[PDB]
Design a protein around this ligand. Structure first.
Ligand SMILES: *[C@@H]1O[C@H](CO)[C@@H](O[C@@H]2O[C@H](CO)[C@@H](O)[C@H](O)[C@H]2NC(C)=O)[C@H](O)[C@H]1NC(C)=O
Ligand SMILES: *[C@H]1O[C@H](CO)[C@@H](O[C@@H]2O[C@H](CO)[C@@H](O)[C@H](O)[C@H]2NC(C)=O)[C@H](O)[C@H]1NC(C)=O
Lengths: 54, 162
């Protein structure tokens, strides 16, 4: 039993990983699965930052 | 100042000497005027220039903060991160402010020194051919025309001649 945030007592817990080239990811589930549709290729690596600002 | 010349036995500077930091004022029958001692002056300009660049360049490598975020149950390391970044900023702020204070004092004294040395340079040429008045000035026993004056500024003042 959980308090209602945005009118929901259910929750979603999200996970991630970096799948390296030539490697495979394997899923198995009975239910409650939030499956990937789209994933992001990392094409350009370099200098960046997340800047907090209004 | 440490060397006693600037705002010391030389009471004040000269608005009328525009062309250099240190120099001479002459007064004889032909007239009077200011003349900058360029060499002493250029020496000072090279030293101060080097100083500024030395200061700027020494502060070149210095702490750069990066953004790092932490969840609600990572308060300890969040605090650590903050104390760490603030700590380095305070250290570099101290270094910068103290360097400026210390080197400002040395710059003012440096000028005082250059004046004292220019005064002694002239004193050591003239020796007992002039009265040391005690205010930066030397009153000649002989007439000293413009070529005579120039030889004082030269380093060429022929003492045995007078
Ligand atoms: C898919 O994943 C498999 C292993 O789970 C990867 O292994 C490659 O597969 C072939 C075998 O048929 C090898 O000859 C290749 O050398 C592997 N390729 C590379 C580039 O290492 C498989 O490569 C992946 N599929 C691809 C690359 O099409
Ligand atoms: C400094 O000044 C003195 C005096 O002006 C110079 O000696 C004279 O030099 C001129 C021009 O070279 C000659 O024509 C005169 O015969 C010299 N007279 C006397 C009384 O010295 C000296 O050459 C200068 N030295 C410098 C600029 O280093």
């Amino acid at each position: 039993t959980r308090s209602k945030v945005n009118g929901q007592s259910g929750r979603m817990e999200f996970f991630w990983t970096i799948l390296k080239p030539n490697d495979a990811i394997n899923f198995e589930s009975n239910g409650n699965f939030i499956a990937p549709e789209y994933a992001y290729k990392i094409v350009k690596k370099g200098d960046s930052t997340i800047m907090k600002s209004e | 100042g440490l060397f006693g010349a600037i705002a010391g036995f030389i009471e004040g500077g000269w608005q009328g000497m525009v062309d250099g930091w240190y120099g001479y004022h002459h007064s004889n029958e032909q007239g009077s005027g200011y003349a900058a001692d360029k060499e002493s002056t250029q020496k000072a300009i090279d030293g101060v220039t080097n100083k500024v660049n030395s200061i700027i360049d020494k502060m070149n490598t210095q702490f750069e903060a990066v953004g790092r975020e932490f969840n609600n149950l990572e308060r300890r390391i969040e605090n650590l991160n903050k104390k760490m970044e603030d700590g380095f900023l305070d250290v570099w702020t101290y270094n910068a402010e103290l360097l400026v204070l210390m080197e400002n004092e040395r710059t003012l004294d440096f000028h005082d020194s250059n004046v004292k040395n220019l005064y002694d340079k002239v004193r050591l040429q003239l020796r007992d051919n002039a009265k040391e008045l005690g205010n930066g000035c030397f009153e000649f026993y002989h007439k000293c025309d413009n070529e005579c004056m120039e030889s004082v500024r030269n380093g060429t003042y022929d003492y045995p001649q007078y």
